[PDB]
Amino acid sequence: GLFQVVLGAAIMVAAFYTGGASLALMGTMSSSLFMMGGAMVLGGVMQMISPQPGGANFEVQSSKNKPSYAFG
Amino acid sequence: ATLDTFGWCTQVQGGGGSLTTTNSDRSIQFGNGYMQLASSGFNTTRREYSVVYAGEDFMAVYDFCNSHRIKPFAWTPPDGKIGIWVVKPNSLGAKPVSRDVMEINVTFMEQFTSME
Amino acid sequence: LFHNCLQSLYPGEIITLIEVDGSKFGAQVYRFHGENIQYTPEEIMQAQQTGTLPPKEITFRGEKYGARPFGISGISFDSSGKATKPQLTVANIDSRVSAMIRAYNGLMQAKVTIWITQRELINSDGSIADGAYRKLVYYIERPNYVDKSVARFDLTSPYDMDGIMIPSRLTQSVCYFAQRGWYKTGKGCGYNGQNGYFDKDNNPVDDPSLDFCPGTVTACRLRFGANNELDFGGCAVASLQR
Amino acid sequence: DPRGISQGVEMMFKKMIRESCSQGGEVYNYIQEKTG
Amino acid sequence: SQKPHNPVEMEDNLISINKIKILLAVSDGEIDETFSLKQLMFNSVPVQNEDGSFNFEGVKAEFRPGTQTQEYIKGMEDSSSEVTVNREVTTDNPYTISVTNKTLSAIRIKMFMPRGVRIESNGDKNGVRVEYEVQQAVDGGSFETVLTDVIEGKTMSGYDRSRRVNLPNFNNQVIFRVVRKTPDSNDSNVVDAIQVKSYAEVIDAKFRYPLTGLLFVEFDSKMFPNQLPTISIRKRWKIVNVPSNYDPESRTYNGNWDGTFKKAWTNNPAWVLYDLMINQRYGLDQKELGIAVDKWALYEAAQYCDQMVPDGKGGTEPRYLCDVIIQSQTDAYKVIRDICSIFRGMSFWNGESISVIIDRPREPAYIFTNDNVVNGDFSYTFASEKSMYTTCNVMFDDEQNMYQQDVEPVFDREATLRFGNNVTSITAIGCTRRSEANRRGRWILKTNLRSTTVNFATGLEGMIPTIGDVVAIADNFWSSNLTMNLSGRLLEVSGSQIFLPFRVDARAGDFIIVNKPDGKPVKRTISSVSADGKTIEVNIGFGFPVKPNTVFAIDRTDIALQQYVVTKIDKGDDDEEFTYKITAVEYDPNKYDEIDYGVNIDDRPTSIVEPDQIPRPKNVQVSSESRIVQGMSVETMIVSWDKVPYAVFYDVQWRKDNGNWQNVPQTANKEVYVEGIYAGNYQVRVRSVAGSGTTSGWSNIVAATLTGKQGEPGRPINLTATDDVVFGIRTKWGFSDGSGDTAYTELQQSPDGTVDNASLLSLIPYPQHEYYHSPMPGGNIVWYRVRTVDRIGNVSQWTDFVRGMAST
Ligand code: SF4
């Protein structure tokens, strides 16, 4: 059938289609939304295939050898 | 505070003049057919009316209706209980019957307190 | 077999069954079913003349199943690591489920299996081979909802690693052995009665019923003898002097 | 109409994030426990 | 190991002084006044240990309580000085101090030694010890001896020493006197003169720091060659608003608490919670608004907080005490909830109550039945499986390790038989005793197991009950199928009042329960039921009238009411308004008794470490030894001491008599041998050192004299030979015997008649000579000879016998 789309809000509109076809839209929406960029160091599919919480970690050996963000 | 009682008489035709009642009661059902009845305020019945008029001086009545939906007035349609009435928003329409007269439909609500 | 039936355009009726295991605590195993059972007019006339009405039971694999309505929520197998809890719904009319929950502390640690097969694949005596099946297993965690009508349960899997910190051999001063693997077992407890028995206040008793000695080094000093070897797990001086 | 529903949903979520990041919410308690 | 140091307080030699000043800030507000040296600590080591002795010797300090009308600390003397000049005498007591300026704070006196020496007949040089004092006067006083200073040593270029004196509060003027407390010398060769050449006086600093507690510590710089020690105190703290009929020390309750407040010290968290919620400087009403707090609930909390309950090793003790110190900024909600967690009492409301309710064995207050909720329906929900624990870990601030954290777990055996291991971790917020940590752990362990929440919604009845009121539930659903719960009735007091329920038979039980408009529900024994019509007659007597269509409930021994605790009440709008959502949790009437009797802890055992006072050497002896080389004599100096435990490496230091200490290099032999020490007087003292570096105190001065060559007796010279065969000369031979290689010379005496009264000295020959010829004789004249030996150290020898001579 004809598909007249609404530009303002597509997320809620897409679910209202009965069409015996909302399942594909739901699956695609979830899969695509999981990969959206944010503020995390590690990327996309590297998390979805086999997760690995990534981040540089340094042990502390002395208080006078740990720098900072230029306070003093 | 010069109030103006509604004029131009009244008539009943085409489902005009039927009253309407509005209440302000809240009730809760307990169980086993037990209910608790309560009312917030003073339990006043805001009566509503619908009026249809057709006559030669339709323009003056239309002017009155358009200019008196902000300030109230008095009008005693069925029984003589004087009331403080005000026209509802966007509830005024006109229908044509002849080149000289028109048909006008208006709805009235009863206001209490304020009176101005 | 069942794969071939599923791989066709017109499969037949499909059945789903649930059972709950509680024999670990001493709880009977329950079994439920639905699907509605039709009644023949001859049975109706027999019930009319004799004035009785027997409830309908149903015979699948093993022993028969009861007649209770139910429902199952979303089931997913995600490799992203997120753990999802499906929901159970069980109809409750005779309050038997509520009494079970009251008496048996909510039957939390229970084992549930879900069986899905096809009706005509089952022979007339309810015996089918292991060449084709569909088995799902979960564990109950909480009786989420209890009312006069519907009782609802949540399920998880051993993949839910909430809590469960890995290194737990903390340097304590109170008998880490007598927390997980308790007294009189050969793991860490070598105490074999020896010098009698003692109670919560380390009082000397003689019956084999009231026995309890938690943590304190004095307890064992007493159970094991003054100068004899000790099986205490943990150090007496937990931390150095400041 | 889906447009009004979407607008209400986004406004409600915007209020929810502030009511949860404030004193009492799950994120506040989690941060207090973790960072300390 | 422990930090090194060395106590140095016995300043008497030529040595300068260097001091360090540290001023510390103490908790805001008023504090107790008990500042004794037994409560001041260096590196978690007390300064003065009861009677004992001084661990860190020579420490000056003064303290303030922290009120508005304090007086400034006389430390941190700065802002230059004035300094006058004069040098008279310190023998016949001259010199005075006539300060008048009231702004003056302290006075510095500098004393001068021009020359200090002493000689003997032998020419050896020693030192001189002299004593002074400094005395105040005050208006009409006894001059109040203050400062005592000792000076010794051997000097040839001068010695300076400046001391510090602090003025007392006065009205008109203050007089200081300088006195000498030793006999004055004479024209004999003993040099001792005292000169004072300073009037260094100055203000110090007028910074009294109002409203804050202070602490001023002074010590020397030589004592610490490494990182300075952390300073701490052990004493009471902030004065709290205590109720009137309350003695904090004895924990009494006179009765009839009337609201009047007093100021004292307490450890009850009930009263140091109210202090935080009301203070305007650093509390909760910061925006100058008087907030309302329920005093009666806090009084009941205080009464419950001091119940006597034993645990551990007997010895009943109060069940909740809190003494904490705050040093970092945290959110107010966190601090308030951490303090409230000691009670585990609820807190709620915003405007008119601000209240706290402790978990007590409370009584029911309101009845709810199937006819007092919406859609006659109750919902049941429970807790997640991960919330049921078996062990909890509790942090600490331990008393016997002196506020170092520790761990004490809490575990219940019964819960471990069904679930497994579920572990938590809760940081204690000030429990200084192990038993209360165990009680706190068992609190959560017991409450988490029992949680059967039941919720429902009601009508206008929600305005009556508040949070914390235990309510009773008579639900038909959970109570099998029998009901005995309606809202009928038809009479007030009439006596069994017919009590016809419009439906439902109901049956015979113990009591029927009614809801009074204001008071607690009243139960009366349902005897003489007479259920002939199955719905007639219940009770015996009743008080006050009862409205029709009122609620009731019936209970039995087999089936009874269920008690719950209300925690949350909610309200609706525009369709619900008069409804009130309510939730509740299962009530427990016996968990406190199980809590109060389920803890067992022995103690913290002692450990093996270095002691704070390393013992001094016990006894010391000084001897010598001798050897003969190159004609002269060589001595030795011998010292010894007992091997004292906890001591590796010793130290030896000695002078002549009084001049200047010199250090013998560090030795571990426990004995010291030094050769070639010249004759004179000597003294020796020996310290002790440990592996860490902490040196002990000084020993007892032991003095010895080295006369020479072990003492030893001389040996007489043998075989004096007199001959009678030499013409015109008389001669004599001899033999200096063994060990005579130190002979300075021989002594030759010649008598004429063998009488010792007629023996006179004749000559004195050199050591490398034994024979002597004396030519001026007459013929046949008889003479006699006597010969002895004198040594280099002028040690004589016993005379020999008299031999005869006969000239030719
Ligand atoms: S001291 Fe020994 S016997 Fe006692 S609990 Fe510990 S391991 Fe077991």
Author numbering:
A (entry chain A): 92 to 163
B (entry chain H): 2 to 117
C (entry chain J): 16 to 257
D (entry chain B): 921 to 956
E (entry chain S): 13 to 820
Article, verbatim:
The distal tip of T1, which is cone-shaped and assembled by proteins gp33, gp34, gp36, gp37, and gp38, displays structural similarity to that of phage lambda. In combination with alphaFold3, we also obtained all atomic models of the tail tip, including the distal tail protein gp37, the hub protein gp36, the central fiber protein gp33, the insertion protein gp34, and the C-terminus of TMP gp38. The structure of the cone-shaped distal tail tip of T1 is highly similar to that of phage lambda. In particular, the features of the T1 tail tip, which are essential for infection, trans-membrane and DNA ejection, are structurally conserved across the widespread lambda-like siphophages with the cone-shaped tip, thus suggesting that T1 is another representative of lambda-like siphophages. Furthermore, structural comparisons of the tail tip among T5, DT57C, Chi, lambda and T1 reveal that with the exception of the conserved and essential structural components of the inverted tip formed by the distal tail protein, hub, and central fiber protein, etc., a variety of add-on components diversify the inverted tip decorated with different lateral fibers, receptor-binding proteins or collars, etc. For instance, the distal tip of T5 and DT57C transform from a triple bifurcation to an extended β-helix structure, while the distal tip of T1 forms a long and flexible α/β-helix fold structure. During infection, the tail tip penetrates the cell envelope. However, whether the tip of T1 is curved during the infection still needs to be further studied.
Siphophage T1 is representative of the T series of model Escherichia coli phages, which has been observed to infect not only sensitive strains of E. coli but also some strains of Shigella dysenteriae. Siphophages possess a long, flexible, and non-contractile tail that plays a crucial role in host recognition, cell envelope penetration, and DNA injection. Connected to the head through a connector complex, the tail of a siphophage consists of three main components: a tail tube, a tape measure protein (TMP), and a distal tip. Using cryo-EM, we resolved the three-dimensional (3D) structures of the icosahedral head, head–tail complex and the tail tip of a laboratory-adapted fiberless mature T1 at resolutions of 3.5 Å, 3.6 Å, and 4.3 Å, respectively.
